[PDB]
Design a protein around this ligand. Sequence first.
Ligand SMILES: CSCC[C@H](N)P(=O)(O)O
Ligand SMILES: [Zn+2]
Length: 545
Amino acid sequence: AKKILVTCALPYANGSIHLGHMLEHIQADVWVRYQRMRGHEVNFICADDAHGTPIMLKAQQLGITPEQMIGEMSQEHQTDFAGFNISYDNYHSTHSEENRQLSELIYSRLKENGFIKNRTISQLYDPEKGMFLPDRFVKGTCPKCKSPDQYGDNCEVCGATYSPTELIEPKSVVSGATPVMRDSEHFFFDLPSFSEMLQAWTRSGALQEQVANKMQEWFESGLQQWDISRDAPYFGFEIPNAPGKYFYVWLDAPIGYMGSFKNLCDKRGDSVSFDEYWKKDSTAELYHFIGKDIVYFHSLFWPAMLEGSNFRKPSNLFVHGYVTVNGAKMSKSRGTFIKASTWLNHFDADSLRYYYTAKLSSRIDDIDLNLEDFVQRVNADIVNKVVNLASRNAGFINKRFDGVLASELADPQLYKTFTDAAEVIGEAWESREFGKAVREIMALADLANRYVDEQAPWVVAKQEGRDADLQAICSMGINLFRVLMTYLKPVLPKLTERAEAFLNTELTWDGIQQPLLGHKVNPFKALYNRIDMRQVEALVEASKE
Ligand SMILES: CSCC[C@H](N)P(=O)(O)O
Ligand SMILES: [Zn+2]
């Protein structure tokens, strides 16, 4: 029994969960459910990333404490994830006592080990509001084309890039006052010291090929010290012995993974598991599912931080690409920037879980949600191939045989073909080659339906004295359905529950080796209905508004 700790990136507390987030949490949940099916001790961990200037300011605008705002967003996020049946063992927050103590601990260890440097820097400062301004909170006139109202380090008119200090007639986005350059002492983590350690980690062959390639680019560019401090006013953790200084959000965010697990352990009254999973000599496995935009933090800063603070490092990073809708980046104007909550008003969770899973692989390529294809694939695969196997046979069993399945498999060889595929399918789930697993499963589905077509139960049903053969044929189809639903259990939690209720049995990975013989099944109303483009149109229109 392996001990596995799996995480998804911590969603920022200043935005609603959208389809992009869902790709990641669904990918991880499918993997996690599969690992649980194989009997491993699994801990699926996540939490809201709740610190930062953006969050501080938004709360101030809304007129509420940052605590109240993040609390509300945390509830919103968890309701959405719950709606998609993401099976977390714990969903915490970076703004917690566990994270505060772990962040202070790791910082102190890094400092004690000589990995923290003090350095003075100059940054735009709002004298009115009395706060340093991150680039995005500085607006002015583009130095090049002279277009007004430009934000940050780039112009949205001529496309020029530059330091905010180059902006003409700068203005604070917060107060409108003119910002001025001001000095301030900052604390830096000496990432460069871990260069060789990180390079070895990169070439070990554990990380995805594409990720390793990206890392080589970063080593080539040269690692730099990392500014991990921010001045007050700020919403975050105060730095020990440094009044008015806070830990930059990205320093405490990943520590949030640890904080969330410590929280879970403490709530369980478990006093040994935290160290068993995080101590340097851990035999437990640690995996982070993340998007390509945050690979730098997880592959360079993070492993280094852990190493320097005497904690074990990630066993592996599982990176995925971006989500596109109809081939392009989500677009608000086109109504393709879809929120998780909105999606659930139109379709069930299983439909999206299946679609993403059918397109996912072990690579970091973008995943495209083509809405036209979505309708076609769900109806073709879920309704017509898998669920069909149950719906086309259950009726005869319930009405003609009192719900009792035959005492023997009509086609043992065919059944063995299905159970024999468990090894390859499980390996595909294990290796994250989801698309491959789905292709294999649907190939079996076609084989199952061909079997039923060949036996023509609709013909046998109307022929005198063929009762025995009818029960045999239909039971066979139902047993093939049993196996298919087992392979799909990690993917379709809800349909699986309905399938288990119909079958009167919990679906376990090894259970497929024992077909259901002389077994009572229950009647069932629509296990899964078809969807149509009208629903897709409604979703897009609702998203536009
Ligand atoms: C410790 S993972 C943190 C991830 C960021 N909050 P984001 O989802 O904004 O990239
Ligand atoms: Zn310009």
